[PDB]
Structures are given as C-alpha cells and as structure tokens.
Design a protein around this nucleic acid. Structure first.
Ligand SMILES: [Mg+2]
Ligand SMILES: [Mg+2]
Ligand SMILES: [Mg+2]
Ligand SMILES: [Mg+2]
Ligand SMILES: [Mg+2]
Ligand SMILES: [Mg+2]
Ligand SMILES: [Mg+2]
Ligand SMILES: [Mg+2]
Ligand SMILES: [Mg+2]
Ligand SMILES: [Mg+2]
Ligand SMILES: [Mg+2]
Ligand SMILES: [Mg+2]
Ligand SMILES: [Mg+2]
Ligand SMILES: [Mg+2]
Ligand SMILES: [Mg+2]
Ligand SMILES: [Mg+2]
Ligand SMILES: [Mg+2]
Ligand SMILES: [Mg+2]
Ligand SMILES: [Mg+2]
Ligand SMILES: [Mg+2]
Lengths: 175, 52, 34, 126, 49
RNA sequence: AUAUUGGCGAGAGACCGAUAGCGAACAAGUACAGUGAUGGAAAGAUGAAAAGAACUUUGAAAAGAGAGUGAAAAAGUACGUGAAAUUGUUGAAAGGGAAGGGCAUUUGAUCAGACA
RNA sequence: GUCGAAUUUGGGUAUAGGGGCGAAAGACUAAUCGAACCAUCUAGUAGCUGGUUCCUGCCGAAGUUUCCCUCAGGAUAGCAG
RNA sequence: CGUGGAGGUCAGUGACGAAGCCUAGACCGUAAGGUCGGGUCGAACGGCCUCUAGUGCAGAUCUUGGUGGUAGUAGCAAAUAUUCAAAUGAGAACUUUGAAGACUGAAGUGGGGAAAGGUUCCACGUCAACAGCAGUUGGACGUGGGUUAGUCGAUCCUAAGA
C-alpha cells in the first residue's frame, strides 16, 4: 500500500509495485515515461519491439552525451536508447498488473496505464581502490517502481436593478 | 568530567593542507582517524568553559 | 463521500476513519441528549 | 514518604531492580489477590501465584473468563491460563500473557508449604 | 526453521546494501587520509609521481 | 580530630538526555589499525501482546495483488514520530543569451471577516 | 651500464635517536630524517589570519597635543558620555 | 521577543487527542515574534509572577552526518584468441562434456619446496552480498570430511652472538 497516487473507484483498477530493484533509476524513469498513459497491450508489444531493437525508448531528461538514432523520430526526438534491464523489469510489473486485473475480473482490452512512477531506492554502495591509495565510491542507483492500470470508460447570475430593467426592456421590445 | 574531550591523541595537520586547521585524530584503520577533536565546535570535543 | 457513495492523491486512512466514526458517535449522542 | 535511609526513591534504580530481578524475586513480584470467598475463608488478601491454581480474569478484554494457570512464565513476567488463548484459522493457538495483578484466585493449589505460608501470614484454614 | 530463515534474511539487508562480503567483512575507512590531504609541493622533492 | 579521581556497599541532584552525558546506554577498551610502544570508532525506540501477515492467485525467485492479524500495517523485524537538502508522478504557470528582489496595478486561481 | 667479483642474495646476529650507520649524498635508520616513532607535561607560547548567534528606540566619536633618543611597545591630552 | 531547567499560582491544557511536524487558509505586533483553522501524529504540555543558565548562527578552507550538479559522463583499450553443438537451468559470450583454433615452449602459463598465510585443500548443498559485464560457476555462502613416522624434520651440537 501507500502508492504515490491512487485511483478513485478501486474496483475498476489494478496495481503493481516493485521495490529496491537493482536497475538504473535514470533508464527506468525514461522507460516508464515512454510507457505512461498507453493501453496495456500496446505498451507490452512496444516493449517487446524495444527489446528486439525495432523501436526505441526516447530519452528526454537523463540524456546528456547520448548517441543519436533514427528511431527517436516516432517521438520527435533524436536521442533514444534500448535499455534492456529496465524494459524487463517494467515488463514484469506490467505482467503482474495484468494478472491482478484478471484476478479482479476486469476487461483486459480496456486497461490503460493510468499511473506509473519511478523514484530512487537506497543506493548500493560498493567502493573501488584508485590511484595514490584512494577509495572512491562505486554505487548502484536502484529504483522503486509502481503502477496502476485502469479500465477506460466511455450558475446564478447576480444582476443590478439597472441590468434587470435593461433585460426587461429588451424582452418587451422583442417578441 | 574534567577529562571529557581530552582523552584523545590529535594534532593539527598544518596550514596549506586544503582542510581546516583543527586538530585531527591520528592513527588509522577506524572512522575516528582524521576527525576533528578538542574543539567546542567539534563532535566529541570539550565543551566551552567546562562547569566546575 | 465514502459513506454516501481517474487518479487522485487524496486518501483516507483507516486510523483517521475510525477516529471520525467515534467522534461522530460522540456528537450524535450529544444531539440525542439535547 | 519514606523514612529509612536504606530505601531509595530513585526511579532508575527501581526500574533496574525490577527488570533485573532474579527468578525467586519475580515469584514474589508475580502475586495475585484472592477472591472475596477465599479472602473470607483464609483470612489473607494476596498470595504468590503458582502453576495449579484456578483464576478469574477481572481486567482486560478477557475479563470474566475462568481457567487453571497453565504456566508461570517468570522470564516474561506473565502467566498463561489454559482456556484463555488467541486462535487462528490454520489451527494455531497462542496463549494470552496475563499479569497476576489483573487476576483473582478462586481456588488455591494447597500443599504443605502453601498451608505453612497461609498460616505464617495469619491464616485460619479448617 | 523457515521462521528463523526469514529472520536471518531480513537481518542481512543492511550489510547487503553496504555490499559486505559477509559477516566477516569489517573494513573501516578512515575519515581523511593525511597523505592525500597534506600536499604542499615546493621546488624540489615530491611525494608522488 | 585530618587525606582519599583506587576497592566494596549505599543515598542523592535547579546536571546530560543518544553529534549530549565517560571513548563506551548496545557481545566497548569491542571492531579495526599498527612490527611495536600504542591508537581507537560507529551503533538505542514494531506492537499491550509476535498475534511477525496462514490461505488463494501472478511470477524461476525476490516479490506483487487479494485476504488476514492488530486500535493502527498513515506500526511489516527497511519497523514510534518522520523535518531539510535532493528526487518521481500529477495539476497549474512562465520561458527569443540567467534567475531571484522593491513599488504599483491587470489577469487567473484561492480565501477570511461583516451580514439585521 | 655491469655481468666471476670491492659480485648478487636467504637466514642468523650486532649497532637505537642530541644516537646509530655512512666508498660522505646532511645519504639511510619500517611511504616518517635540516633531527625516527609513541604517550605525557599540554587546552605550551600570538607580533598575526579567520570567525564570534535575537529585535527596536535614543545618544553618538576618533588620523589636529605633548612625552619615554628614535623603531616597537606604553603614558598623557583631545573628542563622546 | 525567544530557549533548557527551578519556586509559586491558574483546584491551567490533554485519549471528544499533549508535544512535534506539514499547510494554495485566518489574524495581531514597526519588529524580535505571537495567536487561530486544516492535515499528520499518539502522550504529555503551557499562561502569568519570580529563580537560574552549557540560552538564539549564514559564514569560522568550522565539526559530524546526509545530499546534489558534474553524469548515465570520463571510462571498464598492457599480457596475440577465440568458435560450434549438446547438456544443465527461469535465464548461458563467461558453467560442464564433446568438437575445433591457438598459447605458455623445460631460465614454463609444468612439477615441488622455504618465508608467510591458516583450512583457502576435498565433498555435498547452494546464490541475497562479493567476483568494477555476467554467472547455473568460485579461493564466495551453508554443512561436513581430511594431515597416521624408531628411519623426513624439530628434538642433540656448536657459530657470530645472547
Ligand atoms: Mg563521449
Ligand atoms: Mg597501494
Ligand atoms: Mg563530550
Ligand atoms: Mg556518545
Ligand atoms: Mg517510521
Ligand atoms: Mg523537500
Ligand atoms: Mg539557445
Ligand atoms: Mg662488459
Ligand atoms: Mg496535536
Ligand atoms: Mg553555547
Ligand atoms: Mg548552518
Ligand atoms: Mg556573520
Ligand atoms: Mg565548508
Ligand atoms: Mg563512454
Ligand atoms: Mg589483451
Ligand atoms: Mg609456441
Ligand atoms: Mg604443494
Ligand atoms: Mg576448492
Ligand atoms: Mg559484476
Ligand atoms: Mg566453505
């Protein structure tokens, strides 16, 4: 429990989450944003194509000195990548959310990703030895990922006396 | 206690060392090594004007 | 709203809901006594 | 107000003595008052609780339940009664930890030393 | 047995986040290395190349 | 009759309240470091009671979702409260080589008093 | 560069800090040598640098005089209460 | 004006919610600050008259702890070199077997020892952490097994020395 945002009418929604996952937070944020708001089956097929390198995850925020590719033109960008580990974690959470929706009895062809959210888990703090006898940090940035899929469903005016008289006179002048 | 904050073997690393000149704990192999000591502004140091 | 009967961040905890129920019973007892 | 110089009103010392009392001291610390019937019958008010005496719960959610003491768990300052349990769906029964100050003894387990203790406290049995 | 196993697995988490080799990895890093923070190199001999 | 920062046993405080108070409230002169003499940390708080989440379902599993225990899981052995820096999502807004501030008003949003 | 000797090297042993050892470079003496390392006296010494924590009200200065021979460091006088 | 503690009082506040914290809400002070509403929270706390002080921070290349941008960036390019199939497994560039190509080239990338280390040896189980990619593998994790002397050494002798 305690998601970042909940759905009103929880009977038409399913949720999934995964915490302390040893996967890059920046890549996972890009993947989740690339998936945000889509229909569930379309999102799953898109992630399969990303794994097959036929389509790409556009990289919008954490994208300094990334290479350029022609597959970002689908989303009006030049910088996109294919983060396999992030795609696999998000695929696992999508499969779990679909299973939870099926257990609830929701129509699986009307489900869309109404909420998805990645934030930073506590860091994995390895260290390396460096020149002149130094110790430098060597850290993994893990993710907390959560998502909610939702079944998509298809004035007194105050007038002054002058205004009231004007309206009455217009009414008398007209029909 | 009149010995509180004084049971420490610490010395200043000198001027021009890119760090503050507060005395620092010597030795090695523990997190205490290199930490400031003896100061009233220092964690674990002696209080200003200890009560008598 | 839950007594009468998208994505939101407004939730009611069970702790607070039980406290509201208890306080409402207090107020209703006062109303019946007056 | 205390008058002896050999007794301490220090809260820290009292709490340390309570939480580090040995088993024989905890036996005295775990005392239960008698029922009204037993108090009239024996002429004493409270006794240390032991394994085979029957009790009535007079405080808490289990108030009114009767049973026989199942154990005196002195290590956790509690007693266990056989009939007072928390039950689960899978068939698990966990004894409720009751404090003897919240219990009332309705029937004493009487042996030679118990009779001697009652008499030396001032009892009038038989 | 499974209860104690879960207790041990839960207790392992902080050391595993600090990436210790096990219970036996108890390396302690100093706060400041004097040979790294005592550099004042005049015209002459230095302490490193 | 006087001394007493050691030892044993006691009683107290307008003292400190976990970066404080002894270095040490905890398996602390420990862990760790150093050939050695020596140097020397960090680290307290689920709950009244472990009742510490049975059972079902998805997953290779960690786990998730239902369910359940409990006053509370906005207490899940990462556990009382749970600030700031810093971060994610949502909503609103601004942006032609910084931003922030003062006076004044427009626009949008939002709101208290006074109403016999 | 030198490579069969003033050669290279293991182990044992001896020499210890105002001392040793030195085919002499103030070289080396456990990453420490114009003085090894460790603890204590010890919170050692300041001509100097840096910092020094709430508000408002009212009053509000000082480089101009004589001296200790003159630097330095002090005294007096002046100004504000 | 504000803070820790202390004497007195308000027979003060409080499980119908104390303190703390958050707040697009309200008010009083020139101000230091004070007061009220909502949320969160779960057991103590304040007004006034006085006492007392380890009593108020933006700085000190301040102390301790925590966190950013840099940045998914620099980089993971010495030691010629890997490939195919099957098996195992959820998952195989990295495990195992077979099939190949190479290399050390006897001053070895072979076979033993001394110093040092101390169980790392071997078997079974086994993957959270570690092996700067990976991992079903391991000098890793868990549980055990293993070192047999009249003849090999110490032990005995003496060397410089103590
Ligand atoms: Mg580049
Ligand atoms: Mg090195
Ligand atoms: Mg101290
Ligand atoms: Mg301490
Ligand atoms: Mg908490
Ligand atoms: Mg913040
Ligand atoms: Mg531009
Ligand atoms: Mg020659
Ligand atoms: Mg409150
Ligand atoms: Mg102070
Ligand atoms: Mg500050
Ligand atoms: Mg300042
Ligand atoms: Mg600084
Ligand atoms: Mg690169
Ligand atoms: Mg190579
Ligand atoms: Mg060859
Ligand atoms: Mg061998
Ligand atoms: Mg082996
Ligand atoms: Mg790795
Ligand atoms: Mg082993």
């Amino acid at each position: 429990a305690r998601y970042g945002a909940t759905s009103t009418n929880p009977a038409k929604s399913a949720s999934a989450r995964g915490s302390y996952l040893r996967v890059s937070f920046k890549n996972t944020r890009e993947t989740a944003q690339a998936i945000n708001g889509w229909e569930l089956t379309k999102a799953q097929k898109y992630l399969e194509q990303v794994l097959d390198h036929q389509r790409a995850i556009p990289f919008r925020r954490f994208n300094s000195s990334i290479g350029r590719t022609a597959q970002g033109k689908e989303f009006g960008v030049t910088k996109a990548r294919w983060p396999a580990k992030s795609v696999k974690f998000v695929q696992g959470l999508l499969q779990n959310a679909a299973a939870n929706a099926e257990a609830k009895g929701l129509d699986a062809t009307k489900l869309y990703v109404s909420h998805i959210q990645v934030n930073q888990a506590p860091k994995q703090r390895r260290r390396t030895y460096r020149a002149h006898g130094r110790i430098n940090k060597y850290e993994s940035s893990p993710s907390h990922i959560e998502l909610v899929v939702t079944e998509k469903e298809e004035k007194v005016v105050r007038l002054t006396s002058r205004q009231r008289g004007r309206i009455a006179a217009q009414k008398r002048i007209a029909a | 206690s009149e010995k509180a904050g004084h049971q420490t073997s610490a010395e200043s690393w000198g001027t021009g060392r890119a760090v503050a000149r507060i005395p620092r704990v010597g030795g090695g192999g523990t997190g205490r090594s290199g930490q400031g000591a003896f100061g009233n502004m220092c964690r674990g140091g002696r209080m200003f004007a200890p009560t008598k | 709203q839950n007594k009468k009967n998208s994505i939101t961040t407004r939730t009611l905890s069970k702790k607070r809901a039980k406290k509201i129920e208890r306080n409402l019973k207090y107020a209703t007892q006062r109303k019946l006594l007056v | 107000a205390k008058q002896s110089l050999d007794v301490s009103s220090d809260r820290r010392k009292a709490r340390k003595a309570y939480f580090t009392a040995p088993s024989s001291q905890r036996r005295v610390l775990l005392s239960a008052p008698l029922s009204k019937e037993l108090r009239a019958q024996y002429g004493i008010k409270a006794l240390p609780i032991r394994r085979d005496d029957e009790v009535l719960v007079v405080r808490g959610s289990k108030k009114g339940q009767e049973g026989k003491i199942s154990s005196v768990y002195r290590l956790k300052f509690a007693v266990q009664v056989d009939k007072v349990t928390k039950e689960k769906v899978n068939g698990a029964s966990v004894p409720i930890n009751l404090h003897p100050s919240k219990l009332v003894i309705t029937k004493l387990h009487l042996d030679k030393d118990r009779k001697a203790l009652i008499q030396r406290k001032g009892g009038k049995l038989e | 047995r499974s209860k104690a196993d879960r207790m041990a697995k839960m207790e392992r988490r902080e050391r595993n986040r600090h990436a210790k080799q096990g219970e036996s990895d108890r390396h302690n890093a100093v706060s400041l290395s004097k040979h790294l923070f005592s550099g004042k190199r005049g015209v002459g001999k230095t302490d490193f190349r």
